[PDB]
Amino acid sequence: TNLQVPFIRSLLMPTTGPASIPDDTLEKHTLRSETSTYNLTVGDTGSGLIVFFPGFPGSIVGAHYTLQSNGNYKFDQMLLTAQNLPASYNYCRLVSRSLTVRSSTLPGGVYALNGTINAVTFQGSLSELTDVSYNGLMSATANINDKIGNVLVGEGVTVLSLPTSYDLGYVRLGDPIPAIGLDPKMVATCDSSDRPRVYTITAADDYQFSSQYQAGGVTITLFSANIDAITSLSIGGELVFQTSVQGLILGATIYLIGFDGTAVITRAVAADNGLTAGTDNLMPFNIVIPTSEITQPITSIKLEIVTSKSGGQAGDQMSWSASGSLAVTIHGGNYPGALRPVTLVAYERVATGSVVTVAGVSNFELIPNPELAKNLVTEYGRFDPGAMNYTKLILSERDRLGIKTVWPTREYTDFREYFM
Amino acid sequence: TNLQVPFIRSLLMPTTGPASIPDDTLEKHTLRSETSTYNLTVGDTGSGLIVFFPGFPGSIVGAHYTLQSNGNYKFDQMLLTAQNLPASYNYCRLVSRSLTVRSSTLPGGVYALNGTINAVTFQGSLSELTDVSYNGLMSATANINDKIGNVLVGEGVTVLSLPTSYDLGYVRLGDPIPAIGLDPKMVATCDSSDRPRVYTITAADDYQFSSQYQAGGVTITLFSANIDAITSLSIGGELVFQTSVQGLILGATIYLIGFDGTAVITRAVAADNGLTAGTDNLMPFNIVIPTSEITQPITSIKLEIVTSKSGGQAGDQMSWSASGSLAVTIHGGNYPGALRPVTLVAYERVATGSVVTVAGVSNFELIPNPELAKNLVTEYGRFDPGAMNYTKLILSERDRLGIKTVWPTREYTDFREYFM
Amino acid sequence: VPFIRSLLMPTTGPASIPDDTLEKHTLRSETSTYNLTVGDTGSGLIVFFPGFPGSIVGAHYTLQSNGNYKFDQMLLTAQNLPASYNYCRLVSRSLTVRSSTLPGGVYALNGTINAVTFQGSLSELTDVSYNGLMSATANINDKIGNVLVGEGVTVLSLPTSYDLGYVRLGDPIPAIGLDPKMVATCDSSDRPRVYTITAADDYQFSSQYQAGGVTITLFSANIDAITSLSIGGELVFQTSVQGLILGATIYLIGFDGTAVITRAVAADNGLTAGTDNLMPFNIVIPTSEITQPITSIKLEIVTSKSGGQAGDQMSWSASGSLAVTIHGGNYPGALRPVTLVAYERVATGSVVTVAGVSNFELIPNPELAKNLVTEYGRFDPGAMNYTKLILSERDRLGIKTVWPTREYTDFREYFM
Amino acid sequence: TNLQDQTQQIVPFIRSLLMPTTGPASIPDDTLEKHTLRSETSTYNLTVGDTGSGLIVFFPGFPGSIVGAHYTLQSNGNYKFDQMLLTAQNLPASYNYCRLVSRSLTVRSSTLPGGVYALNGTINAVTFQGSLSELTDVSYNGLMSATANINDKIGNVLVGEGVTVLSLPTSYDLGYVRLGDPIPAIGLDPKMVATCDSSDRPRVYTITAADDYQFSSQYQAGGVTITLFSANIDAITSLSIGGELVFQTSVQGLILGATIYLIGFDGTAVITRAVAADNGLTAGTDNLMPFNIVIPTSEITQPITSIKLEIVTSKSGGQAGDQMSWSASGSLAVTIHGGNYPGALRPVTLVAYERVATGSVVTVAGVSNFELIPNPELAKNLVTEYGRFDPGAMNYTKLILSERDRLGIKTVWPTREYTDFREYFM
After folding, report:
1. Searching chain A, which residue's CA lies closest to the CA of residue D89?
2. Where in the cell is it found (chain D) (predicted)?
3. Residue D250 has what DSSP assignment?
4. To pair with D194 at 20 to 30 A between CA atoms, which of A111, A292, B44, D418?
5. From the CA of C409, how many Å to the nearest CA of chain A?
């Protein structure tokens, strides 16, 4: 396809042009629409999973995972939009977005297409999923028109992002602010933090350790909770200890783990702390993870603890008793659309070595940079009395009008040529 | 002049009186309109800068800077309203606000007295300007009816405040809270923390330091980023240190530097921090900064490290590595109006003995503290259908009607005549 | 009008330019054909220089398994133009690229290709990736997304300016030398390009002695040369420690990260205290030395101490500017517009064909001018006003620079 | 008046040429390139010093972001630098190429300080198609004998009326120049910049500083300092000095050092580059001292006018009669990038005022229209297109500029004749 309005036309047919939300938020902005094109190579099994994010506020439209030959997944790439919008804008807000996925081409000298696709959208984040089996993606909703089963790969689906909320603010991007430092490898930015998401986790409530000496120490995994993040985050809290054995030492590292199970980030928050006997001894967990260090989505957190004893003399026990709470802070991640409306697209039995192409467009409302505001004109949006009411009347009669989020592309082409 | 109603009438001409916004945020409140009249002290050079905060939710209306004879600016005072709102009320949001800046000197001859005003408003905050010279202010934005220059100071400007968002809740003010202590200089207040603003900064990524020994230490500075703050803030994170020589101690000091160039807040985050060779050495950042410590707006931040050595009297070396991140959180920073729209009324070369006066009227919507709520009735906003709709019509039709945010006062007087 | 037929349909033949540059010349035209094999990824990048004034066309890069490109070959025209001519200029140019293998069934082979044209040079491009080329231009008729490799793009060459002079090609002059590897040529030098770089302003260095020295890279910047350049300027030093020697080596990095050209400028350069000692830059890079398009430079300095022991704290401090002079690199078309053509994963065993034609105006050699007559241009009035009227509304006429092939064929049949 | 920005409209080219406060247009000459239009402003309040007089040096055809400087006349006849006058927008921050279209600039003083009640001022003005260093005298009376054209001079215009400076063209087809834009570069130094400045038509001064010139002096304690030459160069942006001097002696034990000053217009030093320091020479052998000097645009604060080389000679050892003696030969070269571009240095209008009451503004105010090619960020967020089409606009421009002395078009106007001309031309 050779790629190169009212609000309802841009909402249901976003490959035409960008419009402005008729809500009560009245700020001088500008209009900007751009595409995103890929040819995702397939694995040896000829399967995979494409995790879209329909209403993300800007410039990330999901990732692609490949199904290995031993049941695991593997990260292929984080697939995003055309223009790097944090490099030239400060604020943003999403209007509409559509994407397709199809594989209508063949490898070198073959004769059959071989494929089927299951798609679903559901109200929760990626890490909240029960299972991600190809048979099992059709269970994780009860809505009649948020899931569809085995469309052919030769036609594929077309994912439409229906808007969750309307009266939404503008949110920051991770954009560089001017800073001067003694590092060529220095980043400075102003992240998005508008409606944050906290996770309180109390690890130990008077938990008592007991083991005998090993030449090197014994590692435990204290907890393995499930979190979810796509941009920067912070971790706070404090653990204490209280012992009677004289001269044993301690260490701890904090992991963040992707969807495919591999550790993404490590932080050694404790390293060679001796333990006095008689008082509490604290270790605070005050770490900050930026956005540029997270290369794939995060699915679980995990804390592990070693316990060594200087001057061992094996055959004797160790003992510590711990308590404390933590607070994982996903900055701006409870905003509606940044993490909640996640779709899934699962394809199976595609010919190995072939491709699956995705091709989208995304309509935003940007606010310029302090240089782009020198060179570009912002203005208030247009006015039409009765667009919000007509949009509500469309979305309330949703099963009568048959408007949904997943379909075959032939059905959406027929609906599109019927409306237009 | 002579200072002493629907939302359109109170929006275009805010000196008429207050009104409630036709938005659907329906709390019990009371309308209040107060004023602020200043006579300024023009310096020896004759040139200054009056930076207004138009959409700020309560009681802080601007700041005044006189530029010295050597190019540097100097802070004068903080322009604010007559009654301080946090002493008597508890929540607030802004309706409309006007400010006029002219001279009241009026010569009796035929010629005027010298002095000329520029004015501009722009979408970014105050630290996000390329230049603040008198010439370089009309570069700051690209909209035609959003800046004006070369107006003479007998005529003066009018700063009108057109909105940024409408369905937005109330901002709590920095009100005093009952507290009993032992230091008579303690205060406990409740800040504004509706929509915060975070600035993550990775200060070091395995940066190598290595220098010779001398008396006192080697004082370096790691980074100097530009931030923004009027009210309270808090800085968090840590920063590790590795070495291979053991006799080393180091100190650290943080600075918050305002707009004129001087440090407002100095606070030592490390002092005689002994480090052990071979293993990691932490340095945690746990500092909060209250509002009353901040006397002027703050436009940057920088860190310093003084690396000395215990008992190293001969000429030898000392070295360390470092890596870490920081998370500057300011509270209620991304609330629209709190830092985002700013105007800069600048004047240049006003005659000696001439005054530059600032008049204006601010229209609010308050909730009292519990002492005043014993005596003042609060109620819901009386409604009128279509005032929000007519607001959206007029702001859509803005540039043809010529509704500006900065005016010359003869033009605004003629607009106020031909509107009513 | 004979010039607009050759400008909008360059395979017809050469015509003369109606600008005011009245020189005796002759019209020539030659082709450039390539059958290109693909890699294991089946994905790469072709970077065309559309307005180049002769004898080079572009470059071909293959994309590896990771995100590293690798240079393949430098696409150039059929015969060698500096071997038979002295001066030249560009008139018009077209190139087509597609796959020459065809499906037998009904479903096409894999492969999909993007194209953009860019207003600036190759190095000053924010992201070079298949999704990223579609962001690099805000014009609608300057880019196209997801055409098929079985159909492919056509890259028409719209002008950057007229009223230009002729430029001198890299022709060789006679030279009786002693090396067989000794060439002497007369470079293009008309509207040159200079990058001035202040590398340091009292940067202080300190490091413990280690065996072999201490290596730091002092700067790195993006310069983008194709032809001959030069480095000039000076760095100074001042110490207070006896016995430190310095070495320094400059690198010229191509688009795929590999160092094309390394030049050493210092060896056994001993420093001395209580003085103000210095090092000069006197480097000229000839045209035959340059293998691929350069995109960066960097300077790295090694610091060792004579009489090495454990410690001793080597230390110095430097300052001084620098200047990189690209000889002729600011003439329009030599570097200023670029069309990037990026094909993502295509089928294995396919061959991607490239074919085109490029018309010239050019003054001959001293020998070929013994054999060949030259003339002034052919006067046809009202061709410049008509050319300006065509170009002044290209959005209305729909004159793209990166066509798809079927739409270019339909526009061609319409315009004839 | 209240200067409001434009670029919301385009005009015919000649309305932008003779009345450039109306708005920008494009130039119709053979340079068909995708560009955008952008009009800028410039407003200052130049303060009169102690004597009452001063000098404003404009540059009518300068291609980007610099419109001139301002100097104050002291009590001893010397001048003193105040500031350089610039365009509002820093154009190399978000553009790469440029081409100046038109520009007008008023200079008037119609206000009075606090306490006085009279007005008291006059203004001379002239244009000059040489350079700033090529001016014979720059005084208030010697300004008027700088050219022979009557439509390039005006004398004793009162400051309440003021003047108006127009930029009539120097040449057409003009190319594009490159602005001194920052390219991306990383390096372990905070004060590290890297820029791609202008170079199309450079200007080369060469100097034969010596041809076997002998030196002879007694041994003086500390050294003997002489200046070999001094010459007027007049650069305003970056440059580079190349060449080589050579020395030879027969006396043993001589060291020397060399330094180069770049003198401004007011006689003070701007840039000192110590090229040789503690350079010991041998005897009976040619001793080399090359120059490899590069000055960036950032280090230049005020416009350069003069250059000066200054050698110092010292002898290891010493008494009263050691007879220090050397001999120099060899030539130099000064490469000024983008110097012979028409408008970058060559036309210059000078505005000199006298007797205006001390401590009072002299307001300059203007407008300027360009043709830009955007930054690699701005060219992806902004649309560029070809110039509009009007045939026979260049013919009409050539005709009006041919009959310039008959229609009475002049580069410097006394603002009321200019207002009458603007009314009669509407």
Report:
1. A374
2. Virion
3. S
4. A292
5. 15
Residue pair B247/B300 in contact by the 8 Å Cβ criterion: no
Experimental technique, in short, is cryo-EM
Within 10 angstroms of residue C318's Cβ, the number of other Cβ atoms is 21
Contacts for C336 with CB less than 8 Å, ≥ 6 apart: C51, C119, C120, C121, C160, C330
Long-range contacts of C372-379 (CB under 8 A, 24+ apart): C372/C26, C373/C26, C374/C24, C374/C25, C374/C26, C375/C24, C375/C25, C375/C26, C376/C22, C376/C23, C376/C24, C377/C16, C377/C17, C377/C18, C377/C22, C377/C25, C378/C2, C378/C15, C378/C16
Distance from the B154 Cα atom to the nearest Cα atom in chain D, whole angstroms: 12
| Class of CATH domain C193-326 | mainly beta
Edge-to-edge order in the sheet of strand A300-309? A220-223, A300-309, A248-257, A263-274
Strand ranges (DSSP E) for C312-400? Answer: 314-320, 322-326, 338-343, 351-364
DSSP symbol at D385: B
Q: Which CATH number fits domain D203-336: 2.30.30.100, 1.10.760.10, 2.60.120.660, 3.40.50.1970?
A: 2.60.120.660
Which residues in chain D are closer than 8 Å to A88, comparing Cβ atoms? 377, 380-381
Residue (of B387, B386, B381) closest to B25 by Cα position: B381
Residue type, D327: S
Closest CA to C90 of C58, C51, C33: C51
User: Which residues are bridge partners to C326 per DSSP?
Assistant: C193, C229
Q: Which residue, A345, A409, A390, A406, is CA-closest to A160?
A: A406
Neighbours of A386 (CB within 10 A): 10
To the nearest whole Å, the CA of D47 is away from the closest chain B CA by 8
Tokens of A196: 């944050």
Looking at the partner chain, which of B113, B147, B408 has a beta carbon nearest the beta carbon of D111? B113
Are D239 and D334 in contact by the 8 Å Cβ rule? The answer is yes
C119/D346 Cα distance (integer angstroms) = 30
Any chain B CB within 8 A of the CB of A179? yes
Spatial distance between the Cα atoms of D48 and D61, rounded to a whole number of angstroms: 26
Task: Judge contact between C316 and C207, C-beta under 8 A.
Answer: no
**Residue B223 in tokens:** 């980074």
Give Dmax (Cα) for chain B: 84
Task: Please answer whether residues A319 and A213 qualify as being in contact, where contact means their C-beta atoms are separated by less than 8 angstroms.
Answer: no
Rounded distance between C-alpha atoms, residue D145 and residue D136, angstroms: 9
Polymer length of chain A: 420
Coil, strand or helix at B96: strand
Tell me the three state secondary structure of residue D407. helix
Beta pairing partners, B379: B29
From chain C residues 58-117, the ones with a CB under 8 A of any chain D CB are none
Q: How far is D187 from chain C, CA to nearest CA, in Å? A: 4
The answer for residues whose C-beta is within 8 angstroms of residue A2's C-beta and 6 or more apart is C144, C145, C146, C147, C404, C407
Tokens, residue D23: 């708005």
Give break positions in chain B: residue before each, C–N beyond 2.5 Å. Answer: 4
Backbone angles phi, psi at D14, to 5 degrees: -80, -25
∠ Cα C388 C390 C393 (to 5°): 100
- Type of residue found at B141: T
User: Who contacts D355 (Cβ-Cβ below 8 Å, separation ≥6)?
Assistant: D52, D53, D120, D121, D122
Is the CB of residue B316 less than 8 Å away from at least one CB of chain C? yes
Decide if D62 contacts D100 (C-beta within 8 A). yes
Experimental resolution (Å): 3.8
- Is there a contact between B148 and D2 if contact means CB atoms under 8 Å apart? yes
Is the CB of residue A375 less than 8 Å away from at least one CB of chain B?
A: yes
Pick the CATH number of B197-330 from 2.40.50.100, 2.60.120.660, 3.30.360.10, 2.40.128.270: 2.60.120.660
